[PDB]
Design a protein around this ligand. Structure first.
Ligand SMILES: Nc1ncnc2c1ncn2[C@@H]1O[C@H](COP(=O)(O)OP(=O)(O)O)[C@@H](O)[C@H]1O
Ligand SMILES: Nc1ncnc2c1ncn2[C@@H]1O[C@H](COP(=O)(O)OP(=O)(O)O)[C@@H](O)[C@H]1O
Lengths: 245, 265
């Protein structure tokens, strides 16, 4: 289905003030901004893991953190602090037990979701003995299985090899084509070829939301402009990851 | 000082059904003062290879020559510092000081470790009074990476190995950490880097070795790498460096902006 979606302080100062943003299903949003600018905080608010002061809508209707957790999937920056299970398939199956229950479908579903992240064959493995990058694939899998309309990914593939990074991004690119809203912060923008909007966070607020073209023309100095985009500006959209073969 | 790897292979759990061939008959040479990049996908055997060179693993086959001759674990480990890709595999202490001072209290147990730790921490850009008492568990990833490095250069080894030290860092934090690398090799010491971030790391190395499914599928200089290696999955910046190389230019030690004016003209 379709979907559409402020200030915050932890405990001392306000980190986000006057935040105006809008996200729809079927688009990919990338959030940039320097360190401690609020990217992680902003994504948790969207997820409903932080309670913020202000006005948040979900399809027009006001949205409480709760209602967000209902419709927004999350992947932490640190995937360890996210999973609890005896086996890999146990951490996944966790997210679908409200989903009807229904089992013959779970085992068919979990099957699908492990394949996407590349953990097929490790269903019975013990998460406490997985590598860092493997935990990341698992965190993404338990999030994908909830079947939310929005996915919030705070650096989801930081510890994967480049080919796996592309494979995940490409999964995200096909979820978007199927009516998912993707909000994503990443340093691996090189391996992401399809995306709709870039949001820049500065001074505790969003001072930009536009295309990558508009972003390049912008010339922000607090963030890096991906080399790939300048190349695109000078040489054209060549050497896309789909066309490497 | 000088490292030679000669046809080493490595098996985990021989015979048993969970038998894993990590390495297969790999050999290479690392000269003294050399700066080497070890690349290759996940599971290619990068971490294992450098663990064997550091003397943490006894290779199932082959040998490693240190300035010409074999050695045992203890001798190797005094002169080879290795920072693991996951720094929590290194940590065991509740203070940064104790984490760093360890290799000194293990190798040179009469030396006052205080001014040693103080300058190793200074070498990596960690204020001594600000950090000596901090709990490693609650440091930022960049701070954890610094402590991991200081704790392995503290006993003044001649070789430094960094297994994927830039993962989860900013363009800032990466730059500042390579700054630490340049320092190291200004002391004329050899340093090995395991990394997937080639386009950023390559400006700081001499040779590039590539692993794949346990086998070495490339060994050569960085110039050779760009011009000879399969460019099918080079990043956009690597493709520009490669272009420039094939036109007989020197893309290294040149800005991203400067790279771009010399292409697509
Ligand atoms: N648990 C917390 N308690 C107090 N302050 C926090 C907490 N998490 C983050 N902050 C503060 O919020 C600011 C932005 O946080 P964050 O969103 O993590 O930054 P980034 O967008 O760079 O990841 C930082 O200045 C930090 O000091
Ligand atoms: N203690 C172990 N027991 C079984 N298999 C192992 C062990 N250590 C490493 N391996 C295997 O060796 C292969 C190479 O891993 P590693 O040396 O970490 O290379 P890389 O760091 O490049 O992935 C991997 O496929 C891994 O499964």
């Amino acid at each position: 289905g379709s979907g559409r979606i402020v200030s915050f302080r932890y405990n001392g100062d306000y980190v986000l003030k006057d935040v105006n943003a809008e996200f729809e299903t079927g688009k990919i949003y990338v959030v940039v901004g320097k360190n401690g600018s609020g990217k992680t905080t902003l994504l948790k608010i969207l997820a409903g893991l932080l309670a913020a002061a202000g006005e948040i809508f979900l399809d027009g209707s006001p949205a409480d953190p709760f209602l967000l957790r209902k419709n927004v999937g999350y992947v932490f920056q640190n995937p360890s602090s996210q999973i609890i299970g005896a086996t890999v398939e146990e951490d996944v199956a966790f997210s679908l037990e409200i989903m009807g229950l229904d089992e013959s479908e779970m085992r068919k579903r979990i099957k699908k979701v492990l394949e996407l992240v590349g953990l097929s064959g490790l269903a019975a493995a013990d998460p406490l003995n997985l590598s860092g990058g493997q935990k990341q694939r698992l965190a993404i899998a338990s999030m994908l299985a909830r079947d939310t309309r929005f996915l919030a990914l705070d650096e989801p593939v930081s510890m994967l090899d480049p080919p796996s990074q592309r494979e995940i991004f490409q999964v995200l690119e096909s979820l978007k084509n199927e009516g998912k809203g993707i909000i994503l912060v990443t340093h691996e923008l090189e391996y992401l070829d399809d995306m709709d909007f870039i949001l820049h966070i500065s001074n505790g607020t969003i001072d930009f939301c536009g295309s990558w073209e508009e972003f390049v023309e912008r010339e922000f100095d607090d963030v890096e402009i991906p080399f790939k985009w300048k190349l695109w500006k000078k040489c054209g959209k060549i050497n896309l990851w789909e066309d490497r073969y | 000082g000088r490292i030679e790897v000669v046809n080493v292979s490595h098996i985990f759990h021989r015979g048993t059904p969970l038998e894993k061939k990590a390495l297969e008959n790999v050999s290479l040479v690392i000269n003294e003062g050399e700066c080497l990049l070890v690349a290759g996908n996940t599971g290619s055997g990068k971490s294992t290879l450098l663990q064997i060179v550091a003397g943490l693993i006894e290779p199932t086959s082959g040998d490693v020559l240190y300035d010409g001759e074999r050695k045992k674990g203890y001798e190797i480990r005094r002169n080879i510092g290795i920072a693991f890709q996951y720094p929590e595999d290194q940590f065991f202490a509740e203070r940064v000081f104790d984490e760093v001072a360890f290799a000194v209290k293990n190798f040179y147990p009469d030396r006052d470790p205080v001014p040693l730790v103080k300058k190793a921490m200074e070498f990596v850009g960690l204020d001594f009074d600000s950090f000596k008492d901090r709990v490693p568990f609650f440091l930022s990833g960049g701070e954890k990476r610094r402590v991991a490095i200081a704790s392995v250069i503290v006993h003044e080894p001649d070789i430094l190995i960094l297994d994927e030290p830039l993962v989860g860092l900013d363009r800032e934090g990466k730059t500042d950490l390579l700054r630490i690398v340049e320092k190291w090799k200004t002391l004329g010491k050899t340093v090995i880097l395991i990394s997937h971030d080639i386009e950023t790391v390559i400006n700081h190395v001499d040779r590039v070795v590539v692993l794949e499914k346990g086998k070495k599928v490339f060994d050569g200089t960085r110039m050779e790498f760009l011009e000879k290696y399969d460019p099918r999955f080079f990043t956009s910046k690597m493709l520009v460096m490669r272009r420039l190389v094939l036109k007989g230019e020197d893309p290294f030690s040149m800005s991203d902006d400067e790279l771009l004016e010399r292409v697509c003209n």
